[PDB]
Amino acid sequence: SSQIRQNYSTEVEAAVNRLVNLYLRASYTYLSLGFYFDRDDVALEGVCHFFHELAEEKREGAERLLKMQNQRGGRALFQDLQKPSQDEWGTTLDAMKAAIVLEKSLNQALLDLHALGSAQADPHLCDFLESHFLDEEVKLIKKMGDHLTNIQRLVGSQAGLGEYLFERLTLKH
Amino acid sequence: SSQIRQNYSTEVEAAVNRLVNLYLRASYTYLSLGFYFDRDDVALEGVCHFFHELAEEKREGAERLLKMQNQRGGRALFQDLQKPSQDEWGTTLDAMKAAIVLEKSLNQALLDLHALGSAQADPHLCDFLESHFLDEEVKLIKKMGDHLTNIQRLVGSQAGLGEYLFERLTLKH
Amino acid sequence: SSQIRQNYSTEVEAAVNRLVNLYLRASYTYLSLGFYFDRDDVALEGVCHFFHELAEEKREGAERLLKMQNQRGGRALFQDLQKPSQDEWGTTLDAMKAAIVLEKSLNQALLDLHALGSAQADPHLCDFLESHFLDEEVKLIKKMGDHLTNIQRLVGSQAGLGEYLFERLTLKH
Amino acid sequence: SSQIRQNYSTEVEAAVNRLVNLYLRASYTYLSLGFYFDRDDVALEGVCHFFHELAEEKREGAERLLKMQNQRGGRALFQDLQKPSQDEWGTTLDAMKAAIVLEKSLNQALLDLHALGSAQADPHLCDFLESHFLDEEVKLIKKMGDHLTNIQRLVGSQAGLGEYLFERLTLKH
Amino acid sequence: SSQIRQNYSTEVEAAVNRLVNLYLRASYTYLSLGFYFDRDDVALEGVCHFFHELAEEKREGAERLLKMQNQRGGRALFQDLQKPSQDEWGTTLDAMKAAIVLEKSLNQALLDLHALGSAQADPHLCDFLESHFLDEEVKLIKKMGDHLTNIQRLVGSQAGLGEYLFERLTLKH
Ligand SMILES: [Cl-]
Ligand SMILES: [Cl-]
Ligand SMILES: [Cl-]
Ligand SMILES: [Cl-]
Ligand SMILES: [Cl-]
Ligand SMILES: [Ir+4]
Ligand SMILES: [Ir+4]
Ligand SMILES: [Ir+4]
Ligand SMILES: [Ir+4]
Ligand SMILES: [Ir+4]
Ligand SMILES: [Ir+4]
Ligand SMILES: [Ir+4]
Ligand SMILES: [Ir+4]
Ligand SMILES: [Ir+4]
Ligand SMILES: [Ir+4]
Ligand SMILES: [Ir+4]
Ligand SMILES: [Ir+4]
Ligand SMILES: [Ir+4]
Ligand SMILES: [Ir+4]
Ligand SMILES: [Ir+4]
Ligand SMILES: [Ir+4]
Ligand SMILES: [Ir+4]
Ligand SMILES: [Ir+4]
Ligand SMILES: [Ir+4]
Ligand SMILES: [Ir+4]
Ligand SMILES: [Ir+4]
Ligand SMILES: [Ir+4]
Ligand SMILES: [Ir+4]
Ligand SMILES: [Ir+4]
Ligand SMILES: [Ir+4]
Ligand SMILES: [Ir+4]
Ligand SMILES: [Ir+4]
Ligand SMILES: [Ir+4]
Ligand SMILES: [Ir+4]
Ligand SMILES: [Ir+4]
Prior knowledge:
metal binding protein, binds iridium ion, 73% helix, mainly alpha, 0% strand, part of a larger assembly, Ferritin, 173 residues, Iron storage protein, 5 helices, elongated, 5 chains, binds chloride ion
């Protein structure tokens, strides 16, 4: 409310609600990725676990944004959550490529909101993103890039072997 | 690589490689300062320890920059490391004056890189420097200034006495 | 200084300063090797760790030489540190071959300094090298030779598979 | 005896007996130095302790030589122990200068015996000296040189002040 | 001696001395196998360890036979120990095939000595072999046969890969 709100633009408020929607959509995408790798005809437990953990992390990011919206006196507004872009996610390589495309879209949304906060002279917003989001996203994208390189090295002429070995020896089960 | 790189300018990448070189050069200067105060004809153990700890801290700073270069998808490029500016470092006062000149050159390089990141709208870079470098450097320069004042108070007409007492009663052995 | 110096030739003093430069150059080479294997497009953590540990070990060797220089009353003299011979290090096999070439150059420098100490009738120098350097170097070169053989066995017709498996099952992560 | 003796020259045997005499004489000199600094008109406890510890260390060195003489099948032969060179030892500076002259005479005797062992192709003798004596002597002479430099820095125009402060703040009480 | 000897034939006594020689020869063969797999150009630590443990076990078997020879009042007689049949042992498969040939020769010698004890009505001898040797040998030969099958499965078209993986994932390091 207006009782606490100070230096918190309507533009930032609306962009925070849109970023909550993006993070919840990303969480839903990772929920779908994780259950796909739990199928009996896919059966890669370390890949399931990897994506299920990211579903939780993206939900938590949305909840931290909503907490901050209320700390600044803005009002949460929820929109429909679109379903994920695919029903089946292919190989671990296909899934990791889709994940890094998703993360770079979140990172660009964070950078766009930081730029809006900078333009609005909203240093609390800018610090909030720097402290809780920007480095978490750079670290995650580096880890996904590391995983992509290792998955790609393992395809060789024996793709099933490579997919098994990556799941067994890199990912957590 | 281009697989992870996002919002990371070639200007920042090059300036990070130059700052790694500056931090490694500073580490090498402090290595030389510390071994000079271990000479049998100098023999000030607390001064040796002070500079040897700074050699480690500046190496660690370079390694954190290199880690960040790879997290952003830039490429580390190493150059020759120039030898320190002196082979013998004079009195503890001379050495502490040389140290604060070195630290203010590092601090200005940090501030210049922060300004470049600001101009490039690179908030991850700016936060990285604010979080791991800028306050560490202000604290160190304050401590060196405190030490300079105490060393200067102790010169009096008995410079050897004063140098001994500072090493014994302020510095760590 | 001349206050403590005894049986410590100017030839040995100068050769110890050159060996410090060689060890620091080797440390710098291993720093570069380790950050190359941390690139997102290389991404071999066990290889990164292997080389980063050697960077530390070679720095420590240089510092033990400098300590000994001062214990004998010689004077440390630092020179420029040349950059490593490559900016990119190829495969783990290429990197391990470069590492064993580097180590055999250090070992020959140790053996040359031992021979000079022998010729100068400097038994403290000879014992110092025997006690802290010669067996450490033989052990390291044996381990690198063991690793080269295992890497070479794994190339087969599936080089990426082999590189992954060596990193996962031999090297430490 | 001839029952165990092997590769142990009569020259080395005699030189070991002479070195025992030198170490016992050095022990006796340090006994005198320590009791002089315990006089009520001298009264420098940290200096007393420093020299009394060296009296013990030099006795222990003689006893290790005698143990080795019997392990090699040589025969200990004792000679008269000459009294120390002074009855009163002056200032801490005078005493530390006398101590480093004494230690460099012991070190030259060690180096001479090592050279004789080398010439006699007696590697057990050479290793024994390298392992238990040569580095102990280099470390001690470095510490004495460090102390001389600090004592000299403290003389200034207030020699009594400096002598008190060195004893209080460097030496152990 | 005749003071304790009872029901212990000269035939059994001589055959026990021959079996000691066979076990010591087997120990020597396993010593050679283990050091071959420690070569830098072979470098299979789990294979080294496997054979070095068998060298110890075969020595211990010989020592238990010698203990029993003296408990029965026979007299140990030692013969020359022939060197192993090869200086280089080929692949892990070649080495494991040589090991099972060696073990089946030991097992046949045990069975022959049991038959002699049976014929001599020497139940202490027969029980001694049943209790300490016959099942140990059946268990070892089963384990070697298990290993041969797994090594053979791994040759495929990538023999170096298979040899590495067997050493890493079956044998102990
Ligand atoms: Cl709606
Ligand atoms: Cl260059
Ligand atoms: Cl220069
Ligand atoms: Cl007499
Ligand atoms: Cl014979
Ligand atoms: Ir799951
Ligand atoms: Ir799951
Ligand atoms: Ir799950
Ligand atoms: Ir900002
Ligand atoms: Ir693991
Ligand atoms: Ir987990
Ligand atoms: Ir597991
Ligand atoms: Ir030091
Ligand atoms: Ir130091
Ligand atoms: Ir140090
Ligand atoms: Ir900023
Ligand atoms: Ir400290
Ligand atoms: Ir690393
Ligand atoms: Ir590393
Ligand atoms: Ir590292
Ligand atoms: Ir030598
Ligand atoms: Ir393991
Ligand atoms: Ir480790
Ligand atoms: Ir005393
Ligand atoms: Ir005393
Ligand atoms: Ir005493
Ligand atoms: Ir020698
Ligand atoms: Ir103290
Ligand atoms: Ir003490
Ligand atoms: Ir005290
Ligand atoms: Ir081994
Ligand atoms: Ir072994
Ligand atoms: Ir072994
Ligand atoms: Ir039977
Ligand atoms: Ir074992």
